[PDB]
Amino acid sequence: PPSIGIAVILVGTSDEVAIKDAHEKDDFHHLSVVPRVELVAMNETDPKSIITRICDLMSDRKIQGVVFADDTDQEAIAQILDFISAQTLTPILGIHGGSSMIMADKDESSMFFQFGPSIEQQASVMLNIMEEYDWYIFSIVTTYFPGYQDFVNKIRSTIENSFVGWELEEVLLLDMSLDDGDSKIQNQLKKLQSPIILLYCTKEEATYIFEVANSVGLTGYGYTWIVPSLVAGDTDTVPSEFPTGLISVSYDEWDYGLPARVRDGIAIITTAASDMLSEHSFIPEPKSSCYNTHEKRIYQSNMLNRYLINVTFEGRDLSFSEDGYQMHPKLVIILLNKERKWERVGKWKDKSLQMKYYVWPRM
Amino acid sequence: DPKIVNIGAVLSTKKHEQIFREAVNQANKRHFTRKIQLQATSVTHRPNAIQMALSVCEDLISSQVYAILVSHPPAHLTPTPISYTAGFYRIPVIGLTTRMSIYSDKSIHLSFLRTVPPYSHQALVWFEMMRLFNWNHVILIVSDDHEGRAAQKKLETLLEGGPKADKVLQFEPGTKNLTALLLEAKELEARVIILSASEDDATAVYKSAAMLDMTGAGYVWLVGEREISGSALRYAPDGIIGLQLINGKNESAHISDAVAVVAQAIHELFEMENITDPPRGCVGNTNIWKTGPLFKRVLMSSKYPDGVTGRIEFNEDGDRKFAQYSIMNLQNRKLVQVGIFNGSYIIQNDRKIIWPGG
Ligand SMILES: *[C@@H]1O[C@H](CO)[C@@H](O[C@@H]2O[C@H](CO)[C@@H](O[C@@H]3O[C@H](CO[C@H]4O[C@H](CO)[C@@H](O)[C@H](O)[C@@H]4O)[C@@H](O)[C@H](O[C@H]4O[C@H](CO)[C@@H](O)[C@H](O)[C@@H]4O)[C@@H]3O)[C@H](O)[C@H]2NC(C)=O)[C@H](O)[C@H]1NC(C)=O
Numbered sequence: 001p002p003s004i005g006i007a008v009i010l011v012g013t014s015d016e017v018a019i020k021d022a023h024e025k026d027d028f029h030h031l032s033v034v035p036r037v038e039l040v041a042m043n044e045t046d047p048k049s050i051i052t053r054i055c056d057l058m059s060d061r062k063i064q065g066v067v068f069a070d071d072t073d074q075e076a077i078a079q080i081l082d083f084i085s086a087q088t089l090t091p092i093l094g095i096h097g098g099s100s101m102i103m104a105d106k107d108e109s110s111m112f113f114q115f116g117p118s119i120e121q122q123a124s125v126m127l128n129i130m131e132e133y134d135w136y137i138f139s140i141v142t143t144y145f146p147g148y149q150d151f152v153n154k155i156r157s158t159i160e161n162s163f164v165g166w167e168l169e170e171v172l173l174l175d176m177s178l179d180d181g182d183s184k185i186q187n188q189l190k191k192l193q194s195p196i197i198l199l200y201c202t203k204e205e206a207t208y209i210f211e212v213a214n215s216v217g218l219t220g221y222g223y224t225w226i227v228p229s230l231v232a233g234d235t236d237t238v239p240s241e242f243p244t245g246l247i248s249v250s251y252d253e254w255d256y257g258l259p260a261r262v263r264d265g266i267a268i269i270t271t272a273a274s275d276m277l278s279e280h281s282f283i284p285e286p287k288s289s290c291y292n293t294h295e296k297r298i299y300q301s302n303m304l305n306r307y308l309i310n311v312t313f314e315g316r317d318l319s320f321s322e323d324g325y326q327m328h329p330k331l332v333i334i335l336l337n338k339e340r341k342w343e344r345v346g347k348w349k350d351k352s353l354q355m356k357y358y359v360w361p362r363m
Numbered sequence: 364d365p366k367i368v369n370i371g372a373v374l375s376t377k378k379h380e381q382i383f384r385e386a387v388n389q390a391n392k393r394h395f396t397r398k399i400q401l402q403a404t405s406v407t408h409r410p411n412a413i414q415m416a417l418s419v420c421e422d423l424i425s426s427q428v429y430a431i432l433v434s435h436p437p438a439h440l441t442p443t444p445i446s447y448t449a450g451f452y453r454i455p456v457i458g459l460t461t462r463m464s465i466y467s468d469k470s471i472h473l474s475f476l477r478t479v480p481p482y483s484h485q486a487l488v489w490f491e492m493m494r495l496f497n498w499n500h501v502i503l504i505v506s507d508d509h510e511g512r513a514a515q516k517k518l519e520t521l522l523e524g525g526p527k528a529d530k531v532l533q534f535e536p537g538t539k540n541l542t543a544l545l546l547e548a549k550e551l552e553a554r555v556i557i558l559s560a561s562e563d564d565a566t567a568v569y570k571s572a573a574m575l576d577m578t579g580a581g582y583v584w585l586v587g588e589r590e591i592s593g594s595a596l597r598y599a600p601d602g603i604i605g606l607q608l609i610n611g612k613n614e615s616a617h618i619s620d621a622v623a624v625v626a627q628a629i630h631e632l633f634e635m636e637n638i639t640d641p642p643r644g645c646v647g648n649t650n651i652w653k654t655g656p657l658f659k660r661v662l663m664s665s666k667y668p669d670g671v672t673g674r675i676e677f678n679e680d681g682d683r684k685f686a687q688y689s690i691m692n693l694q695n696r697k698l699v700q701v702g703i704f705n706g707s708y709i710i711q712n713d714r715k716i717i718w719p720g721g
Pocket residue numbers: 673674705706707708
């Protein structure tokens with residue numbers, strides 16, 4: 001069988017050896033096409049470094065697809081990858097780190113897919129948590145970080161269509177594209193009454209927001225804050241501003257390790273290529289250049305997407321949504337305990353919530 | 364020896380680069396520049412979006428620009444790569460000529476101002492016309508895309524904060540026969556029709572409307588600028604009224620005003636304490652410019668009364684306020700100016716309006 005190039009790009013320290021091992025199911029591609037995998041190390045995660053690295057790869061070698069993992073909390077990495085994906089029409093999987101942090105409104109032409117939960121799924125996991133503990137009275141805080149509308153909408157849709165006595169008291173929209181010298185954000189947060197607050201924003205934004213919220217007495221006992229995966233981010237990095245008792249939905253590498261993720265990435269791209277080749281007797285030619293994409297564009301498309309989203313491997317459904325998220329991730333509910341360590345306190349699995357505690361111990 | 368503060372620009376031609384240079388040199392003469400002195404750094408547009416992003420890093424951000432002016436090239440090449448790359452560091456981008464409403468969306472373009480208004484702000488002029496000519500019942504037809512819906516949202520906000528929209532009809536962009544949509548409008552009593560649509564979509568509307576005899580006496584048609592440009596003009600019904608943004612395509616005029624505004628803002632910025640320099644280059648740099656959000660606020664709240672393009676302020680989306688429009692009326696198949704919107708007020712000139720039919 002013919003070989004397709006797949007770059008695996010790794011930012012920050014990782015066991016390359018352990019990674020190359022999990023892919024020894026390389027004897028486990030019996031498809032129309034076999035992966036030629038190339039581990040590539042990257043040091044930097046600015047836009048230039050990321051663009052030039054991937055474009056250099058694409059020019060030196062024929063790359064059908066990119067598997068990308070990093071060890072940062074930089075959600076902009078996903079945005080950069082979607083952009084590159086759409087411009088070059090190359091499959092990119094963001095499987096770990098900033099690269100997997102929710103990127104809402106991916107480009108029409110994007111072939112960028114992320115491990116981890118959609119926004120709407122996390123919204124619903126939050127309401128399920130709140131329902132378990134009969135916390136029916138709550139407020140929402142977001143920034144303008146993309147997705148915040150989908151988050152608020154999904155909450156609102158859910159609660160207005162149920163007979164549970166939900167009370168959404170207040171929705172705050174914080175503008176952190178301007179400086180906060182007039183104490184605007186303090187003044188907005190001072191409005192908050194509810195004993196539950198849902199917060200949608202980035203990890204960096206949450207760091208400032210919590211600092212302010214502390215100053216006006218909103219983080220102690222009596223207030224429980226609940227945040228999505230990207231706010232917890234890398235759970236070994238805990239800002240001092242984060243309040244103990246913070247709850248988060250998480251997909252940071254708990255049971256689904258990087259080696260297994262890289263292997264599933266390679267499988268997804270390889271299976272998709274085989275499926276397309278089987279049906280159409282071609283696959284898309286790898287772009288030889290980033291820098292010629294304007295010419296070459298009537299000759300390219302995102303055809304491979306239809307297949308990229310519908311892969312099963314070793315009898316596991318690795319489907320993506322059309323919005324570019326994992327379909328059925330096993331989510332982990334985590335709590336920031338008194339030692340400022342994140343602690344497993346429940347699972348979301350088979351669209352069902354199983355929580356460790358029936359009553360919350362003090363935090 | 365003053366501190367040198369670089370301003371960046373991505374512009375259409377070398378001529379416009381030279382105009383940028385000279386505007387910055389004038390700003391330095393005008394202002395007191397013992398402490399702070401501006402330096403122009405510029406390129407022209409790259410042929411694709413990835414090259415363009417790379418050049419923003421290599422040519423502009425390497426020079427530690429505090430802001431970047433961007434023109435819309437008149438050749439598929441948008442400000443967007445420049446907004447993205449600068450926005451990554453919270454370096455403000457000033458759009459000079461881009462009119463698309465999507466650049467008003469803070470979630471996508473989180474440090475973007477412009478000295479021209481988005482197409483959707485043409486609703487502000489429609490509203491004043493509706494009061495002036497006492498059109499108290501209108502039908503609004505818009506394309507079901509972002510631009511169309513932005514026009515709707517803007518007009519509805521003005522109407523819901525007098526005249527009323529008796530109905531709103533949306534249609535799918537690229538639909539060629541629109542008889543079903545327009546028959547729906549024909550059924551209604553109101554006969555003032557307002558349209559938001561791209562060139563080609565306006566063309567399709569005009570054609571279908573003609574075949575349904577909806578372009579003659581009794582009807583008023585009120586549109587913006589795209590809908591009397593290019594092919595849209597070619598099939599537009601006589602008596603139509605539309606708009607042209609005065610100086611809207613004059614890159615040179617907007618370079619002048621933008622530089623004046625940015626120079627004023629930079630001197631104001633450096634009155635304050637604890638101003639930091641932007642990052643030098645992209646490589647290895649992933650933190651935001653800590654002073655970026657403050658400089659954005661100072662720009663947002665800048666006023667420049669004596670601009671080439673009129674009175675320059677920005678609204679809460681960073682969009683130009685007090686923009687001036689020609690009010691155009693298609694008579695005997697010539698676009699004729701029948702007035703202006705001077706930024707806050709309608710001024711009818713001594714040319715008579717001719718309506719559909721009469
Ligand atoms: C777009 O067009 C509009 C309307 O033409 C302009 O707005 C007007 O700007 C002029 C300045 O040239 C203003 O004229 C001044 O009006 C003052 C009184 O204003 C009150 O009364 C008027 C009329 O009823 C109201 O519209 C207004 O809201 C106030 O309630 C006068 O006191 C001024 O006179 C002073 O200066 C003259 C010099 O000629 C002296 O002789 C006088 O002694 C005195 O010192 C002056 O006449 C006018 O008020 C503005 N109108 C509105 C509605 O705001 C915009 O400026 C224009 N925009 C641009 C960009 O050109």
